[PDB]
Amino acid sequence: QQMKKLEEESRKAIQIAENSRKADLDFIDQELQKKRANDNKFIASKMEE
């Protein structure tokens, strides 16, 4: 039954760590994709007047 709590320990060792660290990455991806949009807009916005 320890071995059972252990299979659960993996689930309780938190596969959600995926989701937690992922959330931190979802944030960096907005910083990144915001910037990607801005890389194309930084080019577009700086010219021509």
Partner 1 sequence: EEDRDNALIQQWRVEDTEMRLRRETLKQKKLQDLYKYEEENEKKLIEA
Residues interacting with partner 1, by CB under 8 A?
39, 42-43, 46-47
Place of tokens 């039954």: 1
CA 8/CA 1 separation, integer angstroms: 10
CB of 3 to partner 1, least distance (A): 54
Q: Looking at beta carbons only, is 3 or 43 nearer to partner 1?
A: 43
CB of 28 to partner 1, least distance (A): 19
Q: Looking at beta carbons only, is 13 or 37 nearer to partner 1?
A: 37
In this structure, what DSSP letter does residue 16 have?
Answer: T
CA 5/CA 44 separation, integer angstroms: 57
